[PDB]
Amino acid sequence: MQALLGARAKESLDLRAHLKQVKKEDTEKENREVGDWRKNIDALSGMEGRKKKFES
Amino acid sequence: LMKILTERGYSFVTTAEREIVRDIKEKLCYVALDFENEMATAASSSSLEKSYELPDGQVITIGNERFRCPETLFQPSFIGMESAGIHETTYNSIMKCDIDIRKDLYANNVMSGGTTMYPGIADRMQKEITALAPSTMKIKIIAPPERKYSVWIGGSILASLSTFQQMWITKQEYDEAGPSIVHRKCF
């Protein structure tokens, strides 16, 4: 009386935690696309002089 | 300016006189960022007048005429033109462009040509557009010392760009097509 419902619970937890597991696999093996970037700036710090080109 | 200087007792009607008024304007006039308040005192006191030496030893001073002249840029009705001014036309050129363009044109209002050298014009034009423009948007004027000379300078830049060397009509294509070629090769 104690073994059958145990086995059924094992199967159900297996299927659910296993879909959870296969998707969490994709989450963990690649966590790079969920990252970000520094996005630096040059900002042209030279407001003391101008440029050589004809347009400037 | 010549008509309002006539009102003040300085009548300029011949060519020499006209060329002189243009020179006076260039050295004495300014836009004013508040026409009515500037006029309220310019028309009441000599403290807002500026002198000019005429070529014959005579002198002239200019009072509210000093700013009423450039004011026509904001009020074209002064010379009989059916227009609200250069800031409304500037505003409409920004406004009539696509909605994703408008923000970039508000922030890049470029003054060019001459008359851009009237003191205060670069600032009044930013004020006049800001007053018409939506909030949030940045309104900004570009007004380098290369003003009035900007078209020539642009010509120098353009004529010498590598990206422009294919835009020239040669004197081959010209004779085969005639001068109407300019409408196909230039603009």
PDB file of C-alpha atoms in Angstrom, chain B:
ATOM      1  CA  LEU B   1      15.680 100.788 -41.834  1.00  0.00           C
ATOM      2  CA  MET B   2      15.947 103.435 -44.561  1.00  0.00           C
ATOM      3  CA  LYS B   3      12.235 104.307 -44.153  1.00  0.00           C
ATOM      4  CA  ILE B   4      12.405 104.540 -40.344  1.00  0.00           C
ATOM      5  CA  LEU B   5      15.652 106.572 -40.489  1.00  0.00           C
ATOM      6  CA  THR B   6      13.698 108.922 -42.815  1.00  0.00           C
ATOM      7  CA  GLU B   7      11.071 109.189 -40.031  1.00  0.00           C
ATOM      8  CA  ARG B   8      13.876 110.374 -37.689  1.00  0.00           C
ATOM      9  CA  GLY B   9      15.134 113.075 -40.098  1.00  0.00           C
ATOM     10  CA  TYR B  10      17.804 111.104 -41.967  1.00  0.00           C
ATOM     11  CA  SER B  11      16.534 110.583 -45.494  1.00  0.00           C
ATOM     12  CA  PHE B  12      18.594 108.168 -47.574  1.00  0.00           C
ATOM     13  CA  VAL B  13      17.248 107.721 -51.131  1.00  0.00           C
ATOM     14  CA  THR B  14      20.212 107.533 -53.595  1.00  0.00           C
ATOM     15  CA  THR B  15      22.743 104.718 -54.111  1.00  0.00           C
ATOM     16  CA  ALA B  16      25.535 106.178 -52.018  1.00  0.00           C
ATOM     17  CA  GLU B  17      23.039 106.734 -49.240  1.00  0.00           C
ATOM     18  CA  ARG B  18      21.651 103.187 -49.537  1.00  0.00           C
ATOM     19  CA  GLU B  19      25.100 101.565 -49.335  1.00  0.00           C
ATOM     20  CA  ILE B  20      25.818 103.697 -46.259  1.00  0.00           C
ATOM     21  CA  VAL B  21      22.614 102.605 -44.510  1.00  0.00           C
ATOM     22  CA  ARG B  22      23.542  98.994 -45.118  1.00  0.00           C
ATOM     23  CA  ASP B  23      26.943  99.652 -43.478  1.00  0.00           C
ATOM     24  CA  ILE B  24      25.249 101.441 -40.557  1.00  0.00           C
ATOM     25  CA  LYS B  25      22.888  98.501 -40.054  1.00  0.00           C
ATOM     26  CA  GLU B  26      25.726  95.988 -40.022  1.00  0.00           C
ATOM     27  CA  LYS B  27      27.537  97.839 -37.236  1.00  0.00           C
ATOM     28  CA  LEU B  28      24.637  99.291 -35.134  1.00  0.00           C
ATOM     29  CA  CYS B  29      21.598  96.975 -35.245  1.00  0.00           C
ATOM     30  CA  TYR B  30      20.633  94.077 -32.920  1.00  0.00           C
ATOM     31  CA  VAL B  31      17.572  91.867 -32.595  1.00  0.00           C
ATOM     32  CA  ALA B  32      16.497  92.364 -28.931  1.00  0.00           C
ATOM     33  CA  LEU B  33      15.085  89.355 -27.040  1.00  0.00           C
ATOM     34  CA  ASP B  34      12.031  91.361 -26.006  1.00  0.00           C
ATOM     35  CA  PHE B  35      11.022  93.833 -28.683  1.00  0.00           C
ATOM     36  CA  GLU B  36       8.377  95.711 -26.752  1.00  0.00           C
ATOM     37  CA  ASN B  37      10.398  96.206 -23.591  1.00  0.00           C
ATOM     38  CA  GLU B  38      13.507  97.121 -25.533  1.00  0.00           C
ATOM     39  CA  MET B  39      11.416  99.624 -27.560  1.00  0.00           C
ATOM     40  CA  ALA B  40       9.828 101.038 -24.441  1.00  0.00           C
ATOM     41  CA  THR B  41      13.208 102.338 -23.346  1.00  0.00           C
ATOM     42  CA  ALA B  42      14.843 102.811 -26.791  1.00  0.00           C
ATOM     43  CA  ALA B  43      12.043 105.136 -27.791  1.00  0.00           C
ATOM     44  CA  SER B  44      12.234 107.025 -24.469  1.00  0.00           C
ATOM     45  CA  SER B  45      15.964 107.647 -24.008  1.00  0.00           C
ATOM     46  CA  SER B  46      19.275 108.411 -25.721  1.00  0.00           C
ATOM     47  CA  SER B  47      20.849 105.878 -23.357  1.00  0.00           C
ATOM     48  CA  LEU B  48      19.948 103.118 -25.837  1.00  0.00           C
ATOM     49  CA  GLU B  49      21.226 104.931 -28.931  1.00  0.00           C
ATOM     50  CA  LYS B  50      24.411 104.204 -30.825  1.00  0.00           C
ATOM     51  CA  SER B  51      26.277 106.601 -33.085  1.00  0.00           C
ATOM     52  CA  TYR B  52      27.747 106.158 -36.539  1.00  0.00           C
ATOM     53  CA  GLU B  53      30.127 108.375 -38.502  1.00  0.00           C
ATOM     54  CA  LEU B  54      28.831 109.239 -41.939  1.00  0.00           C
ATOM     55  CA  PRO B  55      31.512 109.615 -44.729  1.00  0.00           C
ATOM     56  CA  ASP B  56      30.927 113.361 -44.985  1.00  0.00           C
ATOM     57  CA  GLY B  57      31.569 114.264 -41.319  1.00  0.00           C
ATOM     58  CA  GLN B  58      27.910 114.177 -40.327  1.00  0.00           C
ATOM     59  CA  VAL B  59      26.719 111.802 -37.674  1.00  0.00           C
ATOM     60  CA  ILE B  60      23.649 109.698 -37.100  1.00  0.00           C
ATOM     61  CA  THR B  61      22.403 107.920 -34.026  1.00  0.00           C
ATOM     62  CA  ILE B  62      19.948 105.069 -34.014  1.00  0.00           C
ATOM     63  CA  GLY B  63      17.324 104.367 -31.269  1.00  0.00           C
ATOM     64  CA  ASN B  64      14.474 101.870 -31.583  1.00  0.00           C
ATOM     65  CA  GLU B  65      15.284 101.763 -35.296  1.00  0.00           C
ATOM     66  CA  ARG B  66      18.342  99.838 -34.171  1.00  0.00           C
ATOM     67  CA  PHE B  67      16.226  96.791 -33.364  1.00  0.00           C
ATOM     68  CA  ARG B  68      13.050  97.410 -35.359  1.00  0.00           C
ATOM     69  CA  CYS B  69      15.074  96.708 -38.501  1.00  0.00           C
ATOM     70  CA  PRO B  70      15.982  93.016 -37.544  1.00  0.00           C
ATOM     71  CA  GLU B  71      12.586  92.686 -35.850  1.00  0.00           C
ATOM     72  CA  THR B  72      11.137  92.289 -39.371  1.00  0.00           C
ATOM     73  CA  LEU B  73      12.708  88.777 -39.252  1.00  0.00           C
ATOM     74  CA  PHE B  74      10.244  88.010 -36.478  1.00  0.00           C
ATOM     75  CA  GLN B  75       7.601  90.370 -37.910  1.00  0.00           C
ATOM     76  CA  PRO B  76       7.635  90.360 -41.786  1.00  0.00           C
ATOM     77  CA  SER B  77       4.422  92.417 -41.716  1.00  0.00           C
ATOM     78  CA  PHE B  78       6.790  95.390 -41.198  1.00  0.00           C
ATOM     79  CA  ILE B  79       7.598  95.313 -44.936  1.00  0.00           C
ATOM     80  CA  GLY B  80       4.144  94.205 -46.116  1.00  0.00           C
ATOM     81  CA  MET B  81       4.797  90.414 -46.105  1.00  0.00           C
ATOM     82  CA  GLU B  82       2.110  87.943 -45.081  1.00  0.00           C
ATOM     83  CA  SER B  83       4.278  85.991 -42.636  1.00  0.00           C
ATOM     84  CA  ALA B  84       4.692  85.191 -38.950  1.00  0.00           C
ATOM     85  CA  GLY B  85       8.516  85.307 -39.114  1.00  0.00           C
ATOM     86  CA  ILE B  86      11.625  83.160 -39.538  1.00  0.00           C
ATOM     87  CA  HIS B  87      10.982  81.310 -36.297  1.00  0.00           C
ATOM     88  CA  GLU B  88       7.596  80.107 -37.458  1.00  0.00           C
ATOM     89  CA  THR B  89       9.047  78.935 -40.725  1.00  0.00           C
ATOM     90  CA  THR B  90      11.886  77.237 -38.821  1.00  0.00           C
ATOM     91  CA  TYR B  91       9.315  75.661 -36.514  1.00  0.00           C
ATOM     92  CA  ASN B  92       7.227  74.381 -39.424  1.00  0.00           C
ATOM     93  CA  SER B  93      10.232  72.862 -41.152  1.00  0.00           C
ATOM     94  CA  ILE B  94      10.911  70.851 -38.015  1.00  0.00           C
ATOM     95  CA  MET B  95       7.225  70.056 -37.415  1.00  0.00           C
ATOM     96  CA  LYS B  96       6.460  68.976 -40.992  1.00  0.00           C
ATOM     97  CA  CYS B  97       9.232  66.355 -40.955  1.00  0.00           C
ATOM     98  CA  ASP B  98       8.465  62.862 -39.700  1.00  0.00           C
ATOM     99  CA  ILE B  99       7.869  62.394 -36.015  1.00  0.00           C
ATOM    100  CA  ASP B 100      11.152  60.453 -35.544  1.00  0.00           C
ATOM    101  CA  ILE B 101      13.027  63.310 -37.265  1.00  0.00           C
ATOM    102  CA  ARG B 102      11.560  66.216 -35.278  1.00  0.00           C
ATOM    103  CA  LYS B 103      13.677  65.583 -32.172  1.00  0.00           C
ATOM    104  CA  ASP B 104      16.935  65.777 -34.135  1.00  0.00           C
ATOM    105  CA  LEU B 105      16.006  68.865 -36.036  1.00  0.00           C
ATOM    106  CA  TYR B 106      14.929  70.702 -32.816  1.00  0.00           C
ATOM    107  CA  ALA B 107      18.388  70.048 -31.358  1.00  0.00           C
ATOM    108  CA  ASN B 108      20.141  71.111 -34.586  1.00  0.00           C
ATOM    109  CA  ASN B 109      18.698  74.481 -35.604  1.00  0.00           C
ATOM    110  CA  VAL B 110      21.365  75.951 -37.879  1.00  0.00           C
ATOM    111  CA  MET B 111      21.647  79.637 -38.476  1.00  0.00           C
ATOM    112  CA  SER B 112      23.296  80.465 -41.724  1.00  0.00           C
ATOM    113  CA  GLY B 113      23.694  83.271 -44.156  1.00  0.00           C
ATOM    114  CA  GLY B 114      24.330  86.877 -43.132  1.00  0.00           C
ATOM    115  CA  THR B 115      22.058  88.847 -40.635  1.00  0.00           C
ATOM    116  CA  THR B 116      23.070  86.027 -38.257  1.00  0.00           C
ATOM    117  CA  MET B 117      25.584  88.567 -37.135  1.00  0.00           C
ATOM    118  CA  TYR B 118      22.915  90.842 -35.519  1.00  0.00           C
ATOM    119  CA  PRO B 119      23.651  90.531 -31.759  1.00  0.00           C
ATOM    120  CA  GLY B 120      21.149  88.301 -29.982  1.00  0.00           C
ATOM    121  CA  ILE B 121      19.858  86.506 -33.102  1.00  0.00           C
ATOM    122  CA  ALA B 122      21.330  83.147 -32.135  1.00  0.00           C
ATOM    123  CA  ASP B 123      19.647  83.341 -28.753  1.00  0.00           C
ATOM    124  CA  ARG B 124      16.292  84.817 -29.754  1.00  0.00           C
ATOM    125  CA  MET B 125      15.758  82.097 -32.303  1.00  0.00           C
ATOM    126  CA  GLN B 126      16.260  79.410 -29.649  1.00  0.00           C
ATOM    127  CA  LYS B 127      13.788  81.188 -27.378  1.00  0.00           C
ATOM    128  CA  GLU B 128      11.197  81.557 -30.167  1.00  0.00           C
ATOM    129  CA  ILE B 129      11.373  77.881 -31.141  1.00  0.00           C
ATOM    130  CA  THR B 130      11.427  76.690 -27.514  1.00  0.00           C
ATOM    131  CA  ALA B 131       8.186  78.645 -26.990  1.00  0.00           C
ATOM    132  CA  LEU B 132       6.497  76.742 -29.886  1.00  0.00           C
ATOM    133  CA  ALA B 133       8.163  73.359 -29.350  1.00  0.00           C
ATOM    134  CA  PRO B 134       6.814  70.505 -27.140  1.00  0.00           C
ATOM    135  CA  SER B 135       8.404  70.121 -23.713  1.00  0.00           C
ATOM    136  CA  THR B 136      10.966  67.290 -23.155  1.00  0.00           C
ATOM    137  CA  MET B 137      12.548  68.081 -26.530  1.00  0.00           C
ATOM    138  CA  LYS B 138      15.850  69.889 -26.589  1.00  0.00           C
ATOM    139  CA  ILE B 139      15.917  72.990 -28.717  1.00  0.00           C
ATOM    140  CA  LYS B 140      19.361  74.179 -29.714  1.00  0.00           C
ATOM    141  CA  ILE B 141      21.016  76.705 -32.017  1.00  0.00           C
ATOM    142  CA  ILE B 142      24.191  76.328 -33.956  1.00  0.00           C
ATOM    143  CA  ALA B 143      25.720  79.716 -34.789  1.00  0.00           C
ATOM    144  CA  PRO B 144      29.530  79.540 -35.444  1.00  0.00           C
ATOM    145  CA  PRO B 145      31.735  82.583 -36.389  1.00  0.00           C
ATOM    146  CA  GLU B 146      31.650  80.995 -39.831  1.00  0.00           C
ATOM    147  CA  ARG B 147      28.267  82.731 -40.106  1.00  0.00           C
ATOM    148  CA  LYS B 148      27.444  84.600 -43.350  1.00  0.00           C
ATOM    149  CA  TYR B 149      30.539  82.909 -44.799  1.00  0.00           C
ATOM    150  CA  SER B 150      29.050  79.399 -44.281  1.00  0.00           C
ATOM    151  CA  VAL B 151      27.743  78.945 -47.792  1.00  0.00           C
ATOM    152  CA  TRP B 152      31.141  79.750 -49.309  1.00  0.00           C
ATOM    153  CA  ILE B 153      32.858  77.495 -46.746  1.00  0.00           C
ATOM    154  CA  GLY B 154      30.415  74.710 -47.477  1.00  0.00           C
ATOM    155  CA  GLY B 155      31.344  75.173 -51.157  1.00  0.00           C
ATOM    156  CA  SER B 156      35.022  74.761 -50.306  1.00  0.00           C
ATOM    157  CA  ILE B 157      34.301  71.672 -48.267  1.00  0.00           C
ATOM    158  CA  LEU B 158      32.057  70.113 -50.857  1.00  0.00           C
ATOM    159  CA  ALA B 159      34.169  70.914 -53.924  1.00  0.00           C
ATOM    160  CA  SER B 160      37.166  69.147 -52.316  1.00  0.00           C
ATOM    161  CA  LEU B 161      35.406  66.075 -50.824  1.00  0.00           C
ATOM    162  CA  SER B 162      36.351  62.717 -52.312  1.00  0.00           C
ATOM    163  CA  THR B 163      32.643  61.852 -52.052  1.00  0.00           C
ATOM    164  CA  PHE B 164      31.890  64.747 -54.369  1.00  0.00           C
ATOM    165  CA  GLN B 165      34.366  64.075 -57.157  1.00  0.00           C
ATOM    166  CA  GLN B 166      31.802  62.183 -59.177  1.00  0.00           C
ATOM    167  CA  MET B 167      29.281  65.049 -58.939  1.00  0.00           C
ATOM    168  CA  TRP B 168      31.104  67.420 -61.292  1.00  0.00           C
ATOM    169  CA  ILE B 169      29.799  68.064 -64.838  1.00  0.00           C
ATOM    170  CA  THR B 170      32.737  67.926 -67.183  1.00  0.00           C
ATOM    171  CA  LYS B 171      33.044  70.081 -70.297  1.00  0.00           C
ATOM    172  CA  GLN B 172      32.180  67.130 -72.490  1.00  0.00           C
ATOM    173  CA  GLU B 173      28.856  66.167 -71.021  1.00  0.00           C
ATOM    174  CA  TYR B 174      28.039  69.851 -71.007  1.00  0.00           C
ATOM    175  CA  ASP B 175      28.332  70.333 -74.736  1.00  0.00           C
ATOM    176  CA  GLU B 176      26.634  67.087 -75.612  1.00  0.00           C
ATOM    177  CA  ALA B 177      23.642  68.018 -73.392  1.00  0.00           C
ATOM    178  CA  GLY B 178      23.767  71.835 -73.202  1.00  0.00           C
ATOM    179  CA  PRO B 179      23.352  73.856 -69.905  1.00  0.00           C
ATOM    180  CA  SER B 180      20.057  72.123 -69.054  1.00  0.00           C
ATOM    181  CA  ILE B 181      22.364  69.294 -67.907  1.00  0.00           C
ATOM    182  CA  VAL B 182      22.573  71.052 -64.560  1.00  0.00           C
ATOM    183  CA  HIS B 183      19.059  69.786 -63.747  1.00  0.00           C
ATOM    184  CA  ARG B 184      20.186  66.167 -64.170  1.00  0.00           C
ATOM    185  CA  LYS B 185      23.751  66.301 -62.818  1.00  0.00           C
ATOM    186  CA  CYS B 186      23.651  68.873 -60.004  1.00  0.00           C
ATOM    187  CA  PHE B 187      20.188  69.342 -58.495  1.00  0.00           C
TER     188      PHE B 187
END
